């Protein structure tokens, strides 16, 4: 059997995007975009929940904790997909 490290309610593993101006800097400059996830999350569970719900090959998943408690995730997509054409569809 292929167990994950922790079973963590995968339709709630992502919470909200970040709409700061530096996030748009990461879109136009990095082909990346910014999500807010819960602390109980992975570079294997978030990375699977982007290539399925969105339909995009994700390059890397750079995560960090934020001292108010919640977790911040810079997800960088592949070169084949612009983050600007996939972020205006959501509302960025």
């Amino acid at each position: 059997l292929k167990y994950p490290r922790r079973i963590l309610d995968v339709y709630q593993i992502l919470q909200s995007p970040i709409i700061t101006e530096a996030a748009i800097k990461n879109i136009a400059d990095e082909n990346s975009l910014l999500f807010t996830v819960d602390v109980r999350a992975d570079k294997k569970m978030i990375r699977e929940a982007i290539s399925n719900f969105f339909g995009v090959k994700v390059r890397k998943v750079n995560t960090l904790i934020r001292p108010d408690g919640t977790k911040k995730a810079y997800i960088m997509l592949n070169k084949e997909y612009n983050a600007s054409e996939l972020a205006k569809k959501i509302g960025i």
């Binding site: 904790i65 001292p67 108010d68 408690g69």
Partner: protein, 57 residues
Amino acid sequence: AALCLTKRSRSRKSLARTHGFRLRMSTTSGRALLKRRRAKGRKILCTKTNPSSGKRA
């Protein structure tokens, strides 16, 4: 030389191995201390650290 100052910059890992919750729950005496802490009503019955993260504030 130094001063007659007692507490210093010791790591909170070693302060949690002595005054933390595990050595406080590894004895009948220390869990009786937690009977007095929970019986009084202290919001922080130990002074500890965390092996993963620092503080959620």
